[PDB]
């Protein structure tokens, strides 16, 4: 949780700098009272501002002083079903955004099945780690300054960060799909 | 930045995720104005409840939304004077903090005044630690283990083991330099 | 090159730690010829035990020591066509492996032949994993729970996890896209 | 261990990437025994050049297959005693390094207690994260650009990572010293 979080990381930081509630709340220009509240879990209502003030007296982020992610697994797995799928559209009509399953466990992974619906290569703008799978028609890759390949059915490619690229389906082929997993 | 840090990392995260204003919006009971506003750096008000609940619904956490410690640094050096350095009791112990830095938040280096030269009333405590004698003679104890350490001794005390020390037996008192990393 | 990348290293990390190349050779049993041989890329043939012993004189790990995976990338992309897969079989499993790169070694995606439907005869295995349900329906076990995805369903796995599938009772065989990373 | 971790850390490897002993074996050009055995911990006199072959074959680093550093700790605890401390001279004469304690459960970790003994500033050399505690004497130090300062017995400072810098004793005042951290 994040007040309990916050709670925990607050105490933790202040004994780490040798601090009690008196000397930290001297330097914020609180009371030991209010320190000793939230480290009783009572800081919700702190706002951003408030936070990063705290953050830079202890010296450190406010990151550093906020729990993680959190878990939502059930067992150590997460499913979703074809029926719960957000979607979003990059229209110019070009792009069609069918997210999948995504967890907190793993902030990073971002799963799709991309629907490319142009199959006009010259119509590519490059977008700028990532594992792709042409599930569907032919892929026409670009890379690079805005090189290229045509991929069929059934290749896969890593694309490493920041590399810019740009995906259209095989020209003239009409349209292809492709299971894209950002990590 | 707190309130500008967030803006664009926000910015990025809600777009890494593929959603729009609106579907943060829809999800958070907010208007995609205000989520507008909020990567324009207009959320600095946001509470910590409130930045949790955003940072859920973009499955990642507060941490990844918000900016670095900052930088201290002066072309990559920071300096304290003898005079700047708080002084904490440990009412026993005085600790007379060095030197720290937000680009390196884990360094917490101190001059530790031992007051006491009682073994027997060592008192046990507590990442990483190295420690040097700077002064006197320092009695120390671990596990559950001890060492009379000279002037000049140093020691490496590894995350979560107990420890504690005293000046050696009739010693009157010693220092020690810590440095916590 | 690794005889390449180990010169340079060693000769950083002994540098680290104040060791001139008669220290090293002293603690090691060597001439302190030998050790300029070695920063000079003439380390081809040391042993595993020996670059350990190596290791331990100077604190630390073969591979501080050793250089990185390397680059297999093409400015920034790796691509491999269906024909090229490696194939390996589970003998029930066919595991036609996609795409992997030096540059993201714990990237080991497949497509996964289901060919069993009876989920009597699951048998339980096993980072974190992602899976799309590709063709088929399939039954999944975790745990010591159960499910039924259709197409297109997707899932993630943490690490440590015990999990089976099978294709859905009677439907023959299904194939799941596996990306462990 | 050695052998015995790499043993453990290749069949780690290996299954990692649905191999058995066979399939290694043949991208490797030897046999199932061979790769066997190195399972069994017999692999101690593979060679550099050798671990390279397999680290590529598995698509990863030596260090990959690697153990870490290892323990040498007394029930977290190492100490050194002013007695063992081996000493490195700058001769060129101009700094005595006295190394302190170190640990391979911290190999970062370089701690010494340096001797300034040139007293002529202009005489200072750049070498280019570090704290540094002035122990006796006036050091002056300088960094930057091949920005200066003079501090006091018990001053500290922090250096970053790469930040070339180079210290001497007060101009006219003989000598100084100073314990530095490197981590």
Redesign the interface.
Same mark, same amino acid.
């Given at each position: 949780?994040?007040?309990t979080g916050?709670a925990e990381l607050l105490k933790d930081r202040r004994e780490?700098?040798?601090?009690?509630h008196a000397?930290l709340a001297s330097l914020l220009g609180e009371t030991p009272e209010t320190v000793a509240a939230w480290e009783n879990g009572e800081?919700?209502?702190?706002?951003?501002?408030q &936070?990063?003030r705290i953050?830079?007296v202890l010296?450190?982020?406010?990151?550093?002083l /906020?729990?993680? %992610?959190?878990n939502d697994?059930?067992?150590?797995?997460?499913?979703?079903?074809?029926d719960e799928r957000?979607i &979003?559209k990059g229209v110019r009509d070009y792009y069609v955004?069918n997210?999948?399953?995504? /967890?907190?466990? %793993?902030?990073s992974?971002?799963?799709?099945?991309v629907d490319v619906l142009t199959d006009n290569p010259d119509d590519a703008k490059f977008n700028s780690?990532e594992?792709l799978?042409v599930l569907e028609g032919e892929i026409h890759?670009k890379?690079?300054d805005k090189?290229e390949?045509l991929?069929?059915?059934?290749?896969?490619?890593?694309?490493?960060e920041?590399?810019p690229?740009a995906f259209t389906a095989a020209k003239g082929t009409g349209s292809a799909k492709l299971?894209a997993?950002?990590?």
């Open positions: 949780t994040a007040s916050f780490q700098v040798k601090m009690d000397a800081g919700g209502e702190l706002t951003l501002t &936070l990063g953050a830079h010296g450190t982020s406010i990151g550093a /906020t729990p993680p %992610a959190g697994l059930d067992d150590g797995v997460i499913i979703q079903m074809p957000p &979003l955004y997210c999948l399953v995504r /967890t907190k466990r %793993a902030p992974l971002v799963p799709l099945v780690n594992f799978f890759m890379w690079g090189k390949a991929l069929p059915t059934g290749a896969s490619m890593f694309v490493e920041h590399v690229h299971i997993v950002n990590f």
